[PDB]
Structures are given as C-alpha cells and as structure tokens.
Design a protein around this ligand. Structure first.
Ligand SMILES: CCCCCCCC/C=C\CCCCCCCC(=O)OC[C@H](O)CO
Ligand SMILES: CCCCCCCCCCCCCCCC(=O)O
Ligand SMILES: CCCCCCCCCCCCCCCC(=O)O
Ligand SMILES: CCCCCCCCCCCCCCCC(=O)O
Ligand SMILES: CCCCCCCCCCCCCCCC(=O)O
Ligand SMILES: CCCCCCCCCCCCCCCC(=O)O
Ligand SMILES: CCCCC
Ligand SMILES: [Cl-]
Length: 494
C-alpha cells in the first residue's frame, strides 16, 4: 500500500534489491538478477528528497557489497590476525565505504533530476553511474568489484564488449533497467518498449568475429596448479617441497608443452636466492623444446643500496634464456591495498614496489603474452593499455587461496574472462588452487581444472590476431557518450 512510501521501508527494500545483484555474478550467474537489482535502485529512489535517495542508494550498495564481497573476511581474518568479531566489522566497514559511491550516485541524481522522467532514468542515470563507478574504482587505488557488465559474459549483451568495453555494458544495463522501472512506476508502455529495443539492439553484435585464429602458431600449454596451502605457502622451511612439487609436475611435460606456467609467486623465495635452481632449470627447458613462465618475488637492490621488492613473473627455457638481468619479466604495477602496501604513506611510528604502468609483453618460445597478476586482470583499461597487436595470448596468474571456498575466486575468474572477449585473445589463467583455465578469444571456457587440487591443465590453444574496436580505442568512446549524456541531461535540469 502506502507502506512503500515510508523511507525506512524503502531502505529495507534497498538491501534486498541490492543483495539480489550478487546473484547476477558467478557462481550464481543468473544475469536477469542484475536488471532486477538495478530496477530496484532506479525505482526506490523515485520521488524522494535528495538526502533520502542518497540513503537508499547507500543501503542498496550495502546489500550488494555486503552480500557480494563479504568473502574478503577470509583474507582479512587470516592475513592480519585480529579477533574475528573485529574482522567482521572490517568487512562491514569496507562494504560501508563502497556503498558511499552508490549513495553519491543516488543523491546527485535525485538532486539534479528530481522528476520521475526518462531524462533522469535513461540519460542522466547511466552518465552519472559511469562517473560514480569510475570514482569507486580509482579513489584510494580503487575497487571496481561487482560491475554488472561482467554478468553478461554469457549473456545477450556480450557483443558490446569488443566494441566499447565492459563499462558500455554497465552503461546500457543501468539505462535499460531505468526505463523498465519507469514503465512500472508510471504504468506506461513506451519506456517498456524502448527498454526492450535497446536491450535487443546489441544482440547481432555477438555475431562479429573480430579475430583471425593463427592455427600454424598453435602450441600445447601446461599450467601447473601446485596447491600450496596458504598457511604453509611462505613457510621458510618448505620451499624445497614447493620447488619439488612444481619441478616434478613440469619435467615430464618438457619437450611436449611449448609453454609451462607456474602461478603467482610459485617460487616462494627471492629470485636472487634461487640462481642455481633457475640456471639449472633453464638449460633443461632449453635442452627440450620447452619454455617456463613463473611467478616469483624479486627483492632487487637498487642504485641507492636499498631494496625494491616486486611481485614478478620471470621466463626461462626455449626462446627465453633465464637471466637475473633479463628484460623478459613483468613486475606487478597495481598493488592490493593492505595486502601489498599500507595505503596512505602519510603515517609513521613492508610494502611492495610497483612496476611501470605499461610493460612489454613477455616472450616465451616465440609466443607473446600480455601479463597481469592477481586482480590486475580486472582493470580493463590497464590491460588494454598494455595489450599490443602482436600479443598472442592474455596471461594472468593469481593466488586466490586468500578468499577460500567462497564466491570470491568465481567473481575474480568471471572478470578475467571479460578481458578475453574485449581484446579477442585467448586468456591463459594460472592459479595456486583456484580457477586455472583457458579462455577463448570470445570469452568462452576452452579448458578448466577443478579447484583445490594439485594438477596441471594441459591443452592446445590457438593464438588469434586482429584488433577489436575496443582494443583500438580503449574507454574514450564511451566517455564521449557519457559527456554528451551528462551535458545533455544537465542542460535541461539546470
Ligand atoms: C578506506 C576505507 C576502507 C575500509 C576498510 C577496508 C579494509 C579491508 C581491505 C582490504 C583487506 C586486505 C586484503 C588482503 C588480501 C591479500 C592479498 C595479498 O596479500 O597478496 C600479495 C601477497 O601478500 C604477496 O605475495
Ligand atoms: C524483492 C527483492 C528481490 C531480491 C530477493 C533476495 C535475493 C538475496 C540475495 C541472495 C544471495 C546473495 C549472496 C549471499 C551469499 C554470500 O554472501 O555468499
Ligand atoms: C514487494 C515490493 C516490491 C516492489 C518494490 C518497488 C517499489 C518502488 C517504489 C517506487 C516509488 C514511486 C513513488 C512515486 C514516484 C512517482 O510516481 O514519481
Ligand atoms: C584504500 C582501501 C579501500 C579500497 C578497497 C580495498 C580492496 C580490498 C581488496 C580485496 C582482497 C583481494 C586480494 C587479492 O586479490 O590479492
Ligand atoms: C549505449 C546506449 C545507446 C545510446 C544511443 C544514443 C541515444 C539513445 C538514448 C535513449 C533514449 C531513451 C528515450 C525513452 C523514450 C520514452 O521514455 O518514451
Ligand atoms: C528465426 C530463425 C533464425 C535463426 C538464427 C540464424 C542467424 C543467426 C546468426 C548466427 C551467427 C553466429 C556468429 C558466431 C560468431 C563467430 O562467427 O565467431
Ligand atoms: C591515493 C593514495 C593511495 C592510498 C590508498
Ligand atoms: Cl601468495
């Protein structure tokens, strides 16, 4: 009845529609839940004072992030060793912090566009959503987790991503959901019909093959899922076991896999301390026709006699002869706040160093791979900026053990697939215990191995070539459209 007119009621409803969005993502993968959840955000903010709407937008995001990233509890409650009730409160406060952007969005849109209009709902709303999600992903090194475009990796809007990137899918979903909500509140069919047409219009885009496979460059790839337990992962007494596990999994594959991939910091020891093992492995790999790509930590003495410690990938074997001075390596550029550095260096009473934002592809046995470590693979623009036309495969390596048996590693994995569709290359993804797989150049799963197991994924994979429209332009076409919408929307209501 008029129960829905009560602000506190709209806030409770905001939690449910918000938390409903978590179902859009992996493993749930009910992509219609994203439109449900966005319709709630669009409708529940109608006809509210701007500060009430900002609260509703806040409470909507608290349902999303509260239900969707509460897996960070495992990382927190294990990495930083605090009481438990306290690690719960940290997860709340992170879910609260992210919900500020979703409260910012609702407040500004209520303030600038108070009327229940298609202008507010289809023009202002997605342009403002483009900006607020941008800030959520940039401020304090950002956290653009749970963006609804990723739930379309297997959906009808798929074919938009090679054109304009996953954020164009975000933009269209907010638009389509706004007119659906507008139609229901104002019981009018015109925004319903528009919402359908716009939702259907990208459907033929998934028929466009932007890439050309290179069957002559097809190689066999192995990725060793070592399954080194996080409680023992960096124990300074079982490096030998880790070294024996990965080596013994790799030796029988030499001469048969052109490319072998060990996950993030597989070698759990400084690169400078492992020269005899690395020099020895390199010659063996080269003696066979094989090449190895592995993560490792490099504490590198700088010019100033201090140490820069990097999260790195190194290359050995055929076509990439190992050398501590080699240029065939990649240093992680985007570091995990708290996990890899203390955010805000203004304090005083350690922290990884960063590699450059743009780095050349690694080269192993004649194959060029564009690398990302851990959740770097979710930074669509950073990946596209490192991508080169001569790239053969996308490569990401990750240790998802920090998130345990939750929906975390599935969300991470879904986002990495979006990169394969966007730049239309295969994605090689290599992890410690979770979600090691090969993604085809259209985001399909070509191969995966089960989580929490010690084994190697071995399969043939064909490099592709050609440039998608998004690989040629990055994010700037969508920004121009959001500036046009923003300029246009603001011009009327101002
Ligand atoms: C500004 C307000 C924010 C609100 C408060 C938020 C607090 C929780 C945030 C992050 C938890 C840390 C996650 C740590 C996950 C571990 C990742 C990691 O450490 O991986 C690299 C490894 O350590 C090297 O090999
Ligand atoms: C009328 C509102 C419709 C929405 C119905 C409620 C859906 C709630 C979301 C359920 C699952 C969300 C994920 C929580 C599980 C987790 O934290 O791992
Ligand atoms: C069982 C609850 C499910 C439905 C929840 C959605 C309620 C949305 C309320 C829309 C607000 C509209 C109030 C007046 C707006 C207008 O006509 O301008
Ligand atoms: C500044 C802090 C605010 C930004 C949000 C914090 C990000 C939490 C990181 C989630 C844990 C993932 C760990 C990993 O993938 O290595
Ligand atoms: C990326 C999305 C497509 C963008 C195309 C540019 C112009 C489309 C704007 C949407 C029109 C919405 C009008 C609704 C009509 C109504 O309310 O009856
Ligand atoms: C009413 C019946 C029509 C049935 C559908 C016929 C036309 C659909 C076109 C399908 C093309 C799929 C393209 C896949 C992408 C690729 O080629 O890599
Ligand atoms: C904007 C400075 C980075 C601290 C998280
Ligand atoms: Cl690790």
């Amino acid at each position: 009845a008029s129960l829905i007119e009560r602000q506190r009621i709209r806030l409770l409803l905001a939690l449910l529609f918000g938390a409903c969005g978590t179902l859009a993502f992996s493993p749930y993968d009910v992509w219609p839940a994203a439109i449900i959840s966005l319709m709630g955000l669009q409708a529940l903010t109608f006809n509210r004072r701007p500060l009430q709407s900002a609260a509703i937008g806040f409470c909507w995001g608290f349902g999303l992030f509260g239900s969707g990233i509460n897996w960070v509890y495992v990382s927190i409650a294990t990495f930083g060793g605090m009481p438990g009730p306290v690690n719960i409160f940290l997860v709340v406060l992170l879910a609260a912090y992210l919900s500020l952007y979703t409260g910012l969005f609702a407040g500004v849109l209520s303030r600038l566009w108070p009327k229940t209009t298609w202008l507010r709902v289809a023009i202002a709303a997605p342009a403002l959503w483009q900006v607020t999600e941008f800030l959520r992903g940039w401020v304090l090194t950002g956290f653009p987790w749970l963006q609804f475009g990723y739930s379309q990796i297997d959906g009808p809007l798929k074919g938009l991503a090679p054109i304009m990137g996953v954020e164009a899918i975000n933009f269209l979903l907010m638009m389509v959901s706004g007119l659906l909500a507008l139609a229901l509140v104002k019981r009018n069919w015109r925004p319903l019909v528009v919402a359908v047409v716009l939702f259907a219009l990208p459907f033929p885009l998934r028929y466009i093959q932007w890439f050309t496979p290179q069957p002559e460059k097809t190689i066999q790839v192995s990725m060793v899922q070592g399954d080194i337990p996080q409680s023992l992962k960096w124990d300074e007494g079982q490096l030998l076991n880790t070294l024996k596990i990965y080596y013994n999994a790799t030796a029988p594959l030499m001469g048969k896999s052109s490319l072998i991939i060990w996950p993030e910091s597989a070698i759990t020891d400084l690169e400078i301390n492992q020269q005899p093992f690395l020099k020895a492995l390199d010659g063996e790999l080269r003696d066979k026709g094989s090449s190895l790509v592995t993560g490792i930590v490099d504490a590198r003495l700088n010019k100033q006699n201090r140490y820069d410690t990097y999260n790195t990938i190194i290359t050995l074997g055929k076509g990439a002869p190992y050398s501590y001075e080699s240029a065939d390596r990649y240093n992680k550029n985007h570091l995990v706040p708290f996990g890899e550095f203390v955010p805000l260096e203004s304090i005083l009473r350690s922290s990884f160093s960063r590699g450059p934002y743009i780095q050349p592809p690694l080269s192993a046995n004649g194959i060029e791979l564009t690398a990302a470590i851990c959740y770097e693979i979710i930074l669509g623009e950073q990946v596209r900026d490192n991508f080169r036309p001569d790239t053969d495969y996308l490569l990401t390596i990750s240790n998802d053990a920090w998130f345990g048996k939750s929906i975390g590693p599935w969300q991470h994995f879904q986002m990495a697939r979006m990169r394969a569709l966007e730049l239309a290359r295969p994605l090689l993804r290599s992890t410690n215990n979770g979600i090691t797989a090969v993604i085809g150049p259209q985001g399909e799963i070509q191969a995966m191995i089960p989580q929490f197991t010690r084994e190697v994924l071995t399969t043939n994979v064909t490099p592709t070539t050609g440039l998608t429209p998004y690989a040629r332009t990055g994010n700037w076409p969508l920004w121009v459209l959001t500036a046009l919408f923003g300029f246009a929307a603001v011009l009327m209501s101002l």
